Copies of this chain bind each other. A is one copy, B any other.
Amino acid sequence: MTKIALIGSGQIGAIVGELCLLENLGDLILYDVVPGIPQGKALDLKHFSTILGVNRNILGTNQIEDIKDADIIVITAGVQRKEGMTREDLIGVNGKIMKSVAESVKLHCSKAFVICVSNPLDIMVNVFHKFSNLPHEKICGMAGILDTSRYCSLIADKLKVSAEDVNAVILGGHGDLMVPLQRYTSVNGVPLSEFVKKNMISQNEIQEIIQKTRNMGAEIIKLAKASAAFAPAAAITKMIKSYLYNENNLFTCAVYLNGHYNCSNLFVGSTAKINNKGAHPVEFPLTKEEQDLYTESIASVQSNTQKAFDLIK
């Protein structure tokens, strides 16, 4: 009975649709602006479903009114960045597309939980909120779970351990001003600081890893000649799952801050729980230096969000 609507049928959207079919999360509605594309991917996904014994319904469509009564909405519509571009270079073109999608969600399914993915991520979440007229808890963007997977993946490689239980918090905008927290990084419970004391990893090796985590999005674009698709989709699916199954998991994602971390009235990457009712920020006690870094990231997201609103007229 659950309806999952994918607004954008590119790489990310299709793979999210694939993962949702693998876990039987819901019926799919594959939407795109380009005719034929969603209908063809929906065909391929039905045949996939038949081979793997999944039976959920899949509809490919160019009529956005088919999004009605979606429980979940995943928004990937928009242009992706090429080599040499920043995520912020898409601000003009994607802001306008995000506004249009917002307007469509507004009239067709105002009760949905909305996961935004178009870049630059944090900025586009703010745009969607502005024109959608949905409650702020019902809107978020995925980024932190991707950046955290990259940072944890690198930490795990340097320590010669499974990535499976390396956890971390990364705060801030999905961009160069991310703030990975060493204090909030653990290996099956054991703080990262214990591995520095044991000389298994050095403060310089960690700064290196933080730099690679920042540039990772660009590095994949350079190498693969396309932006990351699989990890983003997995991250999104994890947020969907936490919402549908009321799991109340604690992630980093772009969420409405409201007095948390000395910030108010902005969507930005932060620690949050996701459940039945949506995405809810949680404030943890930062050091001065940590909060300073986080505020600096918040400031960019503030500026660029204003820039985005301005360029929409």
A residues near B (Cβ < 8 Å) are 14-15, 18, 22, 36-37, 39-41, 43-53, 55, 60, 82, 84-85, 89, 91-93, 145-146, 149-150, 152-153, 156, 162-164, 166, 216, 219-226, 228-231, 233-235, 238, 303, 306-307, 310-311
In contact, B89 and A307 (Cβ under 8 angstroms): yes
B residues in contact with A45, CB < 8 Å = 230-231
| Pair B47/A231 contact, Cβ less than 8 Å | yes
Contact call A164/B220, Cβ cutoff below 8 A: no
* B-side contacts of A51, CB under 8 Å: 145-146, 149, 231, 234-235, 238
A229 near B44 with CB under 8 A, answer yes
Give the oligomeric copy count. 3
27 inter-chain pairs at a CB distance below 8 angstroms, sorted by A residue, are A18-B230, A37-B223, A37-B224, A39-B223, A39-B224, A40-B220, A40-B222, A40-B223, A43-B219, A43-B228, A44-B224, A44-B230, A45-B231, A47-B146, A47-B150, A47-B228, A47-B230, A48-B234, A50-B150, A51-B234, A82-B310, A84-B306, A84-B307, A85-B310, A89-B307, A92-B92, A92-B311
List 18 additional contacts besides A48-B230, A55-B164; criterion CB under 8 Å. Answer: A18-B230, A37-B223, A39-B223, A40-B222, A40-B223, A40-B224, A41-B224, A43-B223, A45-B230, A45-B231, A47-B230, A47-B231, A50-B166, A51-B238, A52-B234, A82-B310, A84-B303, A84-B307
User: In the complex, which residues of chain B have a beta carbon less than 8 angstroms from the beta carbon of A153?
Assistant: 46-47, 49-50
Min Cβ gap A177→B in Å is: 15
- Nearest chain B CB to A21 CB, angstrom units: 9
Take A45-B230, A146-B47, A234-B52 as given contacts and tell me if A225 and B91 are in contact as well, using a CB distance cutoff of 8 Å: no
Interface residues of A, dominant DSSP:
helix
Please give me the 9 A-B residue pairs with the lowest Cβ-Cβ distance, nearest first: A40-B224, A92-B92, A40-B223, A47-B231, A48-B230, A36-B223, A51-B234, A50-B149, A50-B163
Given the complex, which residues of B lie within 8 Å of A60, measured CB to CB?
223
Residues of B within 8 A of A222 (CB): 36, 40
Residues in B whose Cβ lies below 8 Å from that of A166: 50
Q: Shortest CB–CB separation between residue A253 and chain B, in angstroms? A: 13
Question: Closest CB of chain B to A305's CB: distance in Å?
Answer: 12
Task: Report the separation of the CA atoms of residues A30 and B270 in the bound assembly, to the nearest whole angstrom.
Answer: 35
Chain B: minimal CB distance from A291 (Å): 22
Name the contact of A93 in the complex, choosing from B41, B156, B311 (C-beta under 8 A): B311
Least CB distance from A238 to B in Å reads 6
Tell me which residues across on chain B come within 8 A of A221, comparing CB atoms: 40
Query: What's the Cα separation between A53 and B146 when bound, in Å?
Result: 14
Residues of chain B within 8 A (CB-CB) of A146 are 47, 51
- Max chain B Cβ within 10 angstroms of own Cβ: one of A223, A230, A303: A230
- Chain B residues, CB < 8 A from A162: 55
B220 and A44 contacting across the interface, CB-CB below 8 Å: yes
Question: A311 — which chain B residues lie within 8 A by C-beta?
Answer: 89, 92-93
